[PDB]
Ligand binder design. Structure first.
Ligand SMILES: Nc1nc2c(ncn2[C@@H]2O[C@H](COP(=O)(O)OP(=O)(O)OP(=O)(O)O)[C@@H](O)[C@H]2O)c(=O)[nH]1
Ligand SMILES: Nc1nc2c(ncn2[C@@H]2O[C@H](COP(=O)(O)OP(=O)(O)O)[C@@H](O)[C@H]2O)c(=O)[nH]1
Ligand SMILES: CCOc1ccc(C2=Nn3c(nnc3-c3ccccc3OC)SC2)cc1
Ligand SMILES: [Ca+2]
Ligand SMILES: [Mg+2]
Ligand SMILES: [Mg+2]
Lengths: 67, 421, 440
């Protein structure tokens, strides 16, 4: 029964620590996922704007070829 | 601490912008010299939203005047409240746009856009917490339409996480300057859907009818139309300039009024042009809309309204819930509690009590169908295309602008015919 | 010993905290400067009021709490409020930009900048305690900060303090006073995330409180001041077992032992009595038997639902003021024969009663009347599932068309987070049905 009392208290600590472990990983997952996603949306949005600049350069160029 | 950088562009954009600063200066107790002589402390609690506090307790309006000709901006300086603006924020050109969208967006405006941005950055580094940018311009012109949409795209490159607000002025045959106006409008809308978070549709056809039919004006000048625009803009930013139970900013407005990123065009409304139920019924009336669109021809997505002046808080809450129950067919079911309303204790100048309206109705498609009809009426015969093609453009860009706007209408039609079950 | 560190997140939690701590100072006798003449022990002590109030060398009794908001316009009022000297500047944390009613901005975007700062302020309060008992989080279900930053905070607290008890005082949204649309979005998301990190959560329907102040206080349009001062009374009665002592006083954690049969079932149904105006209280003594019957009335509950249409799993009564067990035992016997009280077959039907002898206190100028006795009922019923039902319905209406979702996606979240949150909420409602079904 002595070795049983050791098993119970040790198991409680193992479960408690596992709860902290899993929670930290679940949190770091969302925080990393949300970071990459938000950066992607900004990267995509800026790219569409840089395409307007390239398009704007061709318009002024196309007019230059008419002068 | 929540600052908002104001920009005005074009002949129309500068005049409707000038009137905006004149009205709100009265509601905050600000003389043309730039000093304060009010009576309430509710005028200086959120004064740093549109004004910068300089030396000598001066409140300089955070506004940037942009144009391609001195003609309009000279009138602002010599007119009332003209000495209150920052002299370095006056960025004007000499060549002009000639009511051409091509010159404003690609040719002329691109030569002056960089000089404007330098002023923008200077007014953004002095912000404790920059909200976003509000732009007042016209879509039936050249500078306001071309360079206006040009500035927006350039701004989002440096400020992508900031909210872009606009007070676009829709052109109309009733108040028409040229014939190439539907072209400039379509090419502008094509940009607005992509680079704006919220846009106020100030239709001139709606403004003309109000002054003509209701206000009884046989010859409605531009001054009469702007008086309705001034009161409209004064209302929609009341909660932004005056403190209350609601902490309001541009983003939070965009979050709650825009269920879909493309459908961000609203329908302004003001009343009057008296009790609470009367003021309420006149606010949802089709004659008191600043956009030529009958709200009963479509359905509402998101609705917001302000009630200024001393009135019963209980009565207002009753009337708003009364207009919903008697008109539950004109509101989508898949958006619960899509009607919000706050009350301001400070009324506008010369009114006991007023009411400003903002609606994201699906009936706004009528405004786009009208412009698209005028657009395709001239584009099918290739009329007046030498103005745009001569600046380096092609028929492909016009096709995209038409196609994108036609898709927008179908999107408004989709969520209108959409049900719950 | 056995201290409880309170936490107030967002405009809701802060303004509610302003009413709660003001009420605490009135019940214990603490001046707005922090001085407490009744307290003779200078520097500290092991008294009952040392659980919520720490002591200094100047005799200033400082609350064990941290106010946090992503925008300062709310807490700035506390910094210059009447009780401005009561708090230390390192307890009032503010940002520069709110979440704009967005869960993603509160949990990820804006929150990440201040979350490490907040914990460090929480840690400092923890290191001053002889033996921490748990935390108290005051927030709203729908506010971008009250839902976003709270969920971010609860996750961190579970890591930095292990399985230490963390109780919620959430604010269930209501159309009559709904600040902004997308309330159900933020509500479902914060309920899904905090669910496994919260040991017990007391919900408060704003509409339920709004209806009481119109009915019991005769107020046409009750303000937040009118609501928060009422909520504070509930919070006061709950923590009355922690802030006071007595021979008939029973610790809250002993009640919590009965209120939580399953880890997921930690949403009690609070009910306060009596709520009455001063005009109606004049020349009308409300006996113990009368305020008890008010507890089993749907119109006086903090969350709008029908307990008669559900089953009880636990029922507690926390009396305060001049109340004797003789009247309580006589009252309960009467109610048990005139009410629709139906327990499940896997738990006792007996009521647990706690009595605190310190008489209730009202805020000077408040609409509540100074009564001799009061009672707060914490009953764990399956009928509280009706609250999730009305909320999930409104959620499913907007997500069926993906409305307002792009504001969440654009800040970093995915549609997967939405779909996962809803399927968990659907699982919660199912669990409330499973516990109601009779055994085999
Ligand atoms: N009962 C009660 N509820 C409140 C109070 N203040 C805010 N709320 C609730 O809070 C919700 C909105 O969140 P707020 O607390 O106002 O602010 P927030 O939580 O920080 O959210 P953000 O605007 O994103 O920063 C509303 O739906 C209200 O129901 C209050 O004083 N009393
Ligand atoms: N309400 C209002 N509309 C105007 C005003 N000036 C021009 N407009 C509208 O704007 C269109 C012409 O735009 P314009 O001012 O020439 O643009 P710009 O040349 O780029 O400055 C016309 O269709 C008018 O209806 C004004 O002062 N007030
Ligand atoms: C339909 C969904 O529900 C809503 C929830 C919140 C709002 C906010 N209002 N708001 C803001 N800035 N200007 C405004 C406004 C503009 C026009 C009229 C009335 C206004 O409100 C006083 S911030 C948020 C609006 C609607
Ligand atoms: Ca002491
Ligand atoms: Mg012109
Ligand atoms: Mg807030």
């Amino acid at each position: 029964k002595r070795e049983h009392e050791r098993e119970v208290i040790q198991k409680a600590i193992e479960e408690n620590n596992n709860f902290i472990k899993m929670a930290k990983e679940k949190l770091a997952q969302k925080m990393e996922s949300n970071k990459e996603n938000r950066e992607a949306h900004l990267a995509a949005m800026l790219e569409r704007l840089q395409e307007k600049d390239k398009h704007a350069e061709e318009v002024r160029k196309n007019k230059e070829l008419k002068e | 601490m929540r600052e908002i950088v104001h920009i005005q562009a074009g002949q129309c954009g500068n005049q409707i912008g000038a009137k905006f600063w004149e009205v709100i200066s009265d509601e905050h107790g600000i003389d043309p010299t730039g000093s304060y002589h009010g009576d309430s402390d509710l005028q200086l609690e959120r004064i740093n939203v549109y004004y910068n506090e300089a030396t000598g307790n001066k409140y300089v309006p955070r506004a940037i005047l942009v144009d391609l000709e001195p003609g309009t901006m000279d009138s602002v300086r010599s007119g009332p409240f003209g000495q209150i603006f920052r002299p370095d924020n006056f960025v004007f050109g000499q060549s002009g746009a000639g009511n051409n969208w091509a010159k404003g967006h690609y040719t002329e405006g691109a030569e002056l856009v960089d000089s404007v941005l330098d002023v923008v950055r200077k007014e953004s580094e002095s912000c404790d917490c920059l909200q976003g940018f509000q732009l007042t311009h016209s879509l039936g012109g050249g500078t306001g339409s071309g360079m206006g949409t040009l500035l927006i795209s350039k701004i989002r490159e440096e400020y992508p996480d900031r909210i872009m607000n606009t007070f676009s002025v829709m052109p109309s045959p009733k108040v028409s300057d040229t014939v190439v106006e539907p072209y400039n409008a379509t090419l502008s809308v094509h940009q607005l859907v992509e680079n704006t978070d919220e846009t106020y549709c100030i239709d001139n056809e709606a403004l003309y009818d109000i002054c003509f039919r209701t206000l009884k004006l046989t010859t409605p000048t531009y001054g009469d139309l702007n008086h309705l625009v001034s009161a409209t803009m004064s209302g929609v930013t009341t909660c932004l300039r005056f403190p209350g139970q609601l902490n309001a900013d541009l983003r939070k407005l965009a979050v709650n009024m825009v269920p879909f990123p493309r459908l961000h065009f609203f329908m302004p409304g003001f009343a009057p042009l008296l009790t609470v139920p009367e003021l309420t019924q006149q606010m949802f009336d089709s004659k008191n809309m600043m956009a030529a669109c009958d709200p009963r021809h479509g359905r509402y997505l998101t609705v917001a309204a302000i009630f200024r002046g001393r009135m019963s808080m209980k009565e207002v809450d009753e009337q708003m819930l009364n207009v919903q129950n008697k008109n539950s067919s004109y509101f989508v079911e898949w958006i619960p509690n899509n009607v919000k309303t706050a009350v301001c204790d400070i009324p506008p100048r010369g009114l006991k009590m007023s009411a400003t309206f903002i609606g994201n109705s699906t009936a706004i498609q009528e405004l786009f169908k009208r412009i698209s009809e005028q657009f395709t009426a001239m584009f099918r015969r290739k009329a007046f295309l030498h103005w745009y093609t001569g600046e380096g453009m092609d028929e492909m860009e016009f096709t995209e602008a038409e196609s994108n706007m036609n898709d927008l209408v179908s999107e408004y039609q989709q969520y209108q015919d959409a049900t719950a079950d | 010993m056995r201290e409880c560190i309170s936490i107030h997140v967002g405009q809701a939690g802060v303004q509610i905290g302003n009413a709660c701590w003001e009420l605490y100072c009135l019940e214990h006798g603490i001046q707005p400067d922090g001085q407490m003449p009744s307290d003779k022990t200078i520097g500290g002590g092991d008294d009952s009021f040392n659980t919520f109030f720490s002591e200094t060398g100047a005799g200033k009794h400082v609350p064990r709490a941290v106010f946090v908001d992503l925008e300062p316009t709310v807490i700035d009022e506390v910094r210059t409020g009447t009780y401005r000297q009561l708090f230390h500047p390192e307890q009032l944390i503010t940002g520069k930009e709110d979440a704009a009613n967005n869960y993603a901005r509160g949990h990820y975007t804006i929150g990440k900048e201040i979350i490490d700062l907040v914990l460090d302020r929480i840690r400092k309060l923890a290191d001053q305690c002889t033996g921490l008992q748990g935390f108290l989080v005051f927030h709203s279900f729908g506010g971008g900060t009250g839902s976003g930053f709270t969920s971010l905070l609860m996750e961190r607290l579970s890591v930095d303090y292990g399985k230490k008890s963390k109780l919620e005082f959430s604010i269930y949204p209501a159309p009559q006073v709904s600040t902004a649309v997308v309330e159900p979005y933020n509500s479902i998301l914060t309920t899904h995330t905090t669910l496994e990190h919260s040991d017990c959560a007391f919900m408060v329907d704003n509409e339920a409180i709004y209806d009481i102040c119109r009915r019991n206080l005769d107020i046409e349009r009750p303000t937040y001041t009118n609501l928060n001062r009422l909520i504070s009374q509930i919070v006061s009665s709950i923590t009355a077992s922690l802030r006071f002592d007595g021979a008939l006083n029973v610790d809250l954690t002993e009640f919590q032992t009965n209120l939580v049969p399953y880890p997921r079932i930690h949403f009690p149904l609070a009910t306060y009595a009596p709520v009455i105006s001063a005009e109606k209280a004049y020349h009308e003594q409300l006996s113990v038997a009368e305020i008890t019957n008010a507890c089993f009335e749907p119109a006086n509950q903090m969350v709008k639902c029908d307990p008669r249409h559900g089953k009880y799993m636990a029922c507690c009564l926390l009396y305060r003021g001049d109340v004797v067990p003789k009247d309580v035992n006589a009252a309960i016997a009467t109610i048990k024969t005139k009410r629709s009280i139906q327990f499940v077959d896997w738990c006792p039907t007996g009521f647990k009663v706690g009595i605190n002898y310190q008489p209730p206190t009202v805020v000077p100028g408040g609409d509540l009347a100074k009564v001799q006795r009061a009672v707060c009922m914490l009953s764990n019923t399956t009928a509280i599932a009706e609250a999730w039902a009305r909320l999930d319905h409104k959620f499913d209406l907007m997500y069926a068309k993906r409305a307002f979702v792009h504001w969440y996606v654009g800040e970093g979240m995915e549609e997967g987070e939405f779909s996962e949150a809803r399927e968990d909420m659907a699982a919660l409602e199912k669990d409330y049905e499973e516990v109601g079904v009779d055994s085999v």
